């Protein structure tokens, strides 16, 4: 793997593959990348951010079991009384598996950053015309552990939403498609667009997937990290119809159940492809790039 | 015609594409079909247009 | 009524759970500006690591924070059997029963406090320098203590400086932070006092650890009248671990005794919490040398 | 008796480098051994080998400090 040698000045193990430590050197980057992205934010835009827990009921009613269930971590704790907690730390000190006496919270990792929005814009009533526009960031997590450097289990992601007609949200997938492209260009990356599909799970997910990218409801801009035949995306836009409009209860200005769209950044895969394409010394990196990112 | 009857009441989830079978309800749609026959789409003909409406599911069967 | 409460309008939305909010504009703008004052007081020679929200589950059981904190740990799960397991755990949900039932552990737990991953890393780098070794440390920390309280969350935000080495780098440091800190919050307009105080260790094996660390000084807490002057909120806190986490990993000092750690605290959001209790929700209306001090 | 009995509990959630059989009575235990976590196991070890709960005002390092004081505790409770 070509990123491997980027590893000794951008991270350090934690002891678990895809969970790292972040360097300042690598930190600077996420940072200048986060205000790269905010400096390009469209009118009208409202900005929130997630931590990195969300509602599991919230998370249930959104559909995320029928399409991802192999990938959520759900937060379990020790729930019980003083004598049952000590009798599970107990099993611990003797060898035994404290784990079994775990039971599920309240809470999950969130899995993308724009969940928690949906109920929160439902809650207003009735979309204004013209609809509504976030700008929403989250840690986010999936199980999926790897050694690959551009594949983590704990990740930044950073979203555009868009909630309103189809037309609204057409409109909004036009523009981020144009000005995803352009800020990569501007980061001297090279990169491709293309319609892919959402890793469902299952016989069902393999109907979903197809159904995706037969529809072109999801573009990705792939970036050569590892090689150029699998190139790994590092940006994305997400039109969802009236899905997540329906499951909320959101309404357009006409009454009918609104649209959403997002396109989507990921932190961490567009600081390793700068760091890939560019190297892990910024005084030697291009003179267009450094005035771009403020350096 | 008489099991496809049937298993779009149950899974369908409508008030085809014109009513209200949804994504969702589809892939319910063609589990389904899964069940009440014993076969298995290939990833080819599962997609949208291979249950587009009641005629289309039964060709797609024989098939 | 809670005297924060209606801070609630202006710095935060419901995610549907006690504890855990989304983020206005407003107030990241002002957690933001914090981080930069703190970073801004920075030693010289001090090494910044960012870590995620999980951190291994090996390496804390290790840390002996189930000994301690059992009850606040949250760990991570997931689905991890067949295909046909899972899906089974989905539809047992469709059909009105519960998925959870087929989670099992995984080896992450979200991390409780920012400093724990600092240690391995020390370790392994071999013996201490002289002068031993600091870093500034940050995470999203998780406690499982759920409450309406704005100043009681269940996902918060820690910024952390560590230093490792000798008993006099260490409690050299930890004046150093104590007096520095005091500083900064009169520079914020801030009403506090520092006092002793113990971490909130479970079960009566826990009083006896608490007695012995409020006895020993090892925790000194900066705390802010929030909710009421009689129970103030802690916000920085100063801590001692004497050899304690040096002897669980290994770590060496530069005259090869087992090296000692402490680290001082800062709540972000607490301390964010408390900027808006103090100064209101317009920042316009913040007292110009409070203003001047952040930047704003 | 209840100084043997003390002993072996030392032996048996102690963690002591020399034997209890070569420590005295009034010899401070932390001055030569005794660590916190493991305190609070002999601690709870006192607390298993009779049936007894101190209260919190003795629930720390002085009631622990020897064999003495810990026999002296026990018995002024
Ligand atoms: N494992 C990961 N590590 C780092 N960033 C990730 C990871 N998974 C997703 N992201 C980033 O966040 C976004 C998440 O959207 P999405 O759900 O489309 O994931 P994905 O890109 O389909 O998946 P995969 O590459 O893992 O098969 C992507 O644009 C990507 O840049
Ligand atoms: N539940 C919480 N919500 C928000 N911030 C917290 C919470 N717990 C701790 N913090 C902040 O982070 C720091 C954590 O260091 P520490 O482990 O000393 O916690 P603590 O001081 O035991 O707290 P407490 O009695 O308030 O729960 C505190 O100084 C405080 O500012
Ligand atoms: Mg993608
Ligand atoms: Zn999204
Ligand atoms: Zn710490």
């Known amino acids: ?36 992205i905010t400096s390009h934010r469209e009118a009208g835009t409202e900005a929130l951010r997630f931590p990195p827990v969300m509602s599991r009921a919230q998370l249930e009613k959104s559909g995320y079991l029928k399409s991802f269930p192999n990938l959520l971590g759900c937060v379990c704790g020790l729930h019980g009384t003083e004598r049952e907690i000590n009798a599970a730390v107990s099993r611990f000190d003797a ?4 784990t079994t006496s775990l039971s599920p919270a309240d809470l999950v990792l969130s899995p993308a950053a724009c969940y928690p929005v949906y109920p929160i814009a439902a809650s207003r009533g009735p979309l204004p015309k013209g ?3 976030f700008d929403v960031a989250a840690d986010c997590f999936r199980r999926e552990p790897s050694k690959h450097l551009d594949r983590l289990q704990s990740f930044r992601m950073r979203e555009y939403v868009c909630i309103g ?57 792939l970036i050569p990290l590892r090689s150029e035949e699998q190139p790994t995306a590092c940006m994305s836009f997400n039109y969802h119809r009236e899905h997540f409009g329906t499951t909320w209860g959101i309404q357009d200005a006409n009454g009918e159940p609104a ?37 | 015609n008489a099991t496809i009857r049937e ?45 587009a409406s009641i005629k289309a599911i039964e060709d797609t069967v024989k098939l």
């Open chain 1, 259 to 295: 649209h959403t769209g997002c396109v989507a950044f990921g932190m961490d895969r567009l600081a390793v492809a700068m760091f890939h394409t560019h190297g892990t010394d910024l005084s030697a990196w291009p003179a267009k790039v450094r005035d771009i990112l403020g350096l």
């Open chain 1, 165 to 221: 007609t189809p037309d609204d949200v057409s409109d909004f997938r036009e523009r981020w498609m144009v000005r995803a492209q352009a800020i990569a260009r501007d980061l001297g990356l090279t990169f491709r667009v293309d319609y892919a599909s959402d890793p469902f799970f299952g016989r069902a997910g393999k109907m979903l997937a197809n159904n995706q990218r037969d529809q072109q409801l999801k573009f990705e801009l």
């Open chain 2, 7 to 51: 298993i779009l009441a149950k899974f369908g989830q409508l008030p085809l594409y014109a009513a209200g079978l949804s994504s969702f309800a589809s892939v319910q749609l063609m589990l389904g079909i899964e069940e009440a026959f014993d076969i298995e789409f290939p990833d080819n003909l599962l997609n949208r247009k291979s249950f």
């Open chain 1, 131 to 133: 609809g509504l526009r």
């Open chain 1, 95 to 98: 060898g035994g598996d404290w």
């Open chain 1, 1 to 36: 793997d070509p990123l491997d040698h980027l590893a000794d000045k951008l991270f350090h193990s934690m002891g678990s593959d895809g969970v790292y430590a972040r360097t300042a050197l690598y930190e600077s980057i996420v940072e200048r990348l986060a205000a790269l």
